[PDB]
């Protein structure tokens, strides 16, 4: 059975997630409206910018993240940002319509919307496939929160300096997850492995996004539609 | 009576203005919505960003502007940008309610809205006073267009290199205005002088905005709300 420290770690992460994810998507009215060349880019940029802020809020509360150097917090935030956004978006993803449903007619997002947002099927096809794969795992709120925290504390990222302290925090959280599925998830006998494999998928997805973002960011007429935060998070500055 | 060259100059400017100013303000639905700390900043930033694009479009058509170096076009665009925006905004300014009325309940802008947008009464009080002064001149479409083109081609700006060619284009346009009021504006006996004095006002207004913008831009929580174009146009990069 799970220890107090392992339990306190779950609590703070679940509380952090609750504080940084709105299931009503009420803030979406504050973004540049969706339009249906690259008509969906303003909305997507506003949506991704908003989510980065929420990922930072969540990160600040991952036990041990606040103790890292500002440099390592930025290094990890920059390189994992898109993967956390992909992870967190599973909550709005629906198997019934193969879309991220965030509201009325306006915030129901199909894959053709992201095409009108400067991205190709080369990124979107494995993304939707990953979204369906993840949903099918019927993760507990604790597993989903832990997987985001595991993803965020991956030592193998460009820019990381203390890849021994980051690996340590990640293993401590991995032990928490592994014990949670055993003790608390019936029929979870294979889940942990399945979850770890979703992290490998995210690296491929991350890679494809980076290429597509460099293409978009290199065109001033497209980069002008992004936000200072998006520009800074996905930009190459060292 | 006015010459063909003087007439062709008026035509192209009037046509340029028509192409770059919408009297229906229909694009305003595409901006981040107005909210009533600094709730009105997203909308103002989107509004100012949109207007910069429109000022560039207008500028590109000012006879002789396209022939200047990219460096001088940028030098003039950066330093005069806010003044052109102040000039062009007079069209939406109303004496009846002392506001810029651009639409329904949402795009009716009073001075308290700009307070909620990171600016103070120190800029807004002379702005409203300038807006009322300008409106009272009951300028012809030609005078208003010419004053914007005069403003844009001011040689006395930081960064300008060919302050002899810019002074030349400006004098050529000044002669066009001076002749237009004489030949075509009854009771315009004093107007030209009154118009030239509005350019001096704009330098004070420009100065106050620059200070207030540096204060806003120095705070990352505020600069993140701006757009890449606003950031680049009002920024210090040489």
């Amino acid at each position: 059975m799970l220890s107090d420290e392992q339990m306190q770690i779950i609590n703070s992460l679940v509380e952090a997630h609750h504080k940084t994810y709105d299931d009503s998507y009420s803030d979406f009215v504050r973004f540049r409206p969706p339009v249906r060349r690259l008509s969906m880019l303003p909305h997507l940029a506003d949506l991704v910018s908003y989510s980065i802020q929420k990922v930072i809020g969540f990160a600040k509360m991952i036990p041990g993240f606040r103790d890292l150097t500002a440099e390592d917090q930025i290094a990890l935030l920059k390189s994992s940002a898109i993967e956390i956004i992909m992870l967190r978006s599973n909550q709005s993803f629906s198997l019934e319509d193969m879309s991220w449903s965030c509201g009325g007619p306006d915030f129901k997002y199909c894959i053709n919307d992201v095409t009108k947002a400067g991205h190709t099927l080369e990124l979107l096809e494995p993304l939707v496939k990953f979204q369906v794969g993840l949903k099918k795992l019927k993760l507990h709120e604790e597993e989903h929160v832990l997987l985001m925290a595991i993803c965020l504390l991956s030592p193998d990222r460009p820019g990381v300096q203390d890849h021994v302290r980051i690996e340590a925090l990640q293993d401590r959280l991995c032990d928490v997850l592994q014990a949670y599925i055993r003790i608390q998830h019936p029929g979870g006998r294979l889940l942990y492995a399945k979850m770890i494999q979703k992290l490998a998928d995210l690296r491929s997805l991350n890679e494809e996004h980076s290429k597509q973002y460099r293409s978009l960011s290199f065109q001033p007429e497209h980069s002008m539609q992004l936000t200072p935060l998006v520009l800074e998070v996905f930009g190459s500055e060292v | 009576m006015l010459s063909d060259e003087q007439m062709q100059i008026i035509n192209s400017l009037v046509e340029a203005h028509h192409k770059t100013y919408d009297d229906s303000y229909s694009d305003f639905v595409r901006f981040r919505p107005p909210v009533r700390r600094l709730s009105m900043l997203p909308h103002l930033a989107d509004l100012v960003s949109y207007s910069i694009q429109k000022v560039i479009g207008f500028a590109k058509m000012i006879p002789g502007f396209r022939d200047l170096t990219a460096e001088d076009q940028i030098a003039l665009l950066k330093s005069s940008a806010i003044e052109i925006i102040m000039l062009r905004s007079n069209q939406s300014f109303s004496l009846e309610d002392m506001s810029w009325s651009c639409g329904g309940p949402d795009f009716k802008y009073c001075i308290n809205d700009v307070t909620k947008a990171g600016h103070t009464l120190e800029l807004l009080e002379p702005l409203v006073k300038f807006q009322v002064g300008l409106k009272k001149l009951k300028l012809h479409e030609e005078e208003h267009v010419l004053l914007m083109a005069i403003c844009l081609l001011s040689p006395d700006r930081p960064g300008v290199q060919d302050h002899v060619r810019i002074e030349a284009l400006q004098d050529r346009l000044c002669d066009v205005l001076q002749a237009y009021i004489r030949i075509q504006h009854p009771g315009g006996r004093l107007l030209y002088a009154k118009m030239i004095q509005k350019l001096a006002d704009l330098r004070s207004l420009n100065e106050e905005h620059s200070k207030q913008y540096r204060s806003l831009s120095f705070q990352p929580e505020h600069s993140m709300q701006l757009t890449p174009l606003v950031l680049e146009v009002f920024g210090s990069e040489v």
């Binding site: 917090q73 930025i74 935030l77 200072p228 | -």
Partner: peptide, 9 residues
Amino acid sequence: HKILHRLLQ
């Protein structure tokens, strides 16, 4: 990384 620094307190 001005924004990222502010956001990370």
